[PDB]
Amino acid sequence: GAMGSMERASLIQKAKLAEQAERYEDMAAFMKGAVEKGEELSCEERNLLSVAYKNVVGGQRAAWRVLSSIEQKSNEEGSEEKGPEVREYREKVETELQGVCDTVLGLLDSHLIKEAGDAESRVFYLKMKGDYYRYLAEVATDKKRIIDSARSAYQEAMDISKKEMPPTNPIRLGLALNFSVFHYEIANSPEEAISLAKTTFDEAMADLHTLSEDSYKDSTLIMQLLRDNLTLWT
């Protein structure tokens, strides 16, 4: 790979520079290079990996949604025929998005998840796996199998997190938030989504008297997003 000649520590240093410069494509490339050195990632390094690809795919998702919206209106009654360009360009963005998801999933499978034994790394990577199958599901039309893959990854992450992490652990909370969104937006299970978000919120509240000052802002933010969703859903 193009990063094969760069020191691991240099890749990490440049990923942090790319983050400061909001150069997320570069950041992802540097972190892919770091993963491919074959050593496990630290907590800080996992965060760099996730933020890089989250921002890359986030921009692709936002663009895909803009184009898909334009495409669907072009297929409403009364809409003037305009040729294949909207579909073509939506497909172009879609294919690029799928390629990024496939790249992330390949890294997780080679071999981050295999070597992750600690709960904090294993749940983190399985959550990522669920997240990127979910992003694939958003554009899939095939779709059932992708949805099943997302659910299986989220479920294994959930089982570990509940056995090995306190309720206010930010990774546990962020997994529950995203799995509840999966239920609501992807899997047509709004009641499961609401139940998961509420149980997660309530149990985190009762655990707050143990939560570290370190993690307070992360976990409070995610708790507020759980609350925001519940307000939106109920």
Binding site: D131, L177, N178, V181, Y184, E185, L221, I222, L225, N229
Partner: peptide
């Protein structure tokens, strides 16, 4: 519905 932004 929101995930972390």
């Amino acid at each position: 519905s929101n995930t972390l932004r």
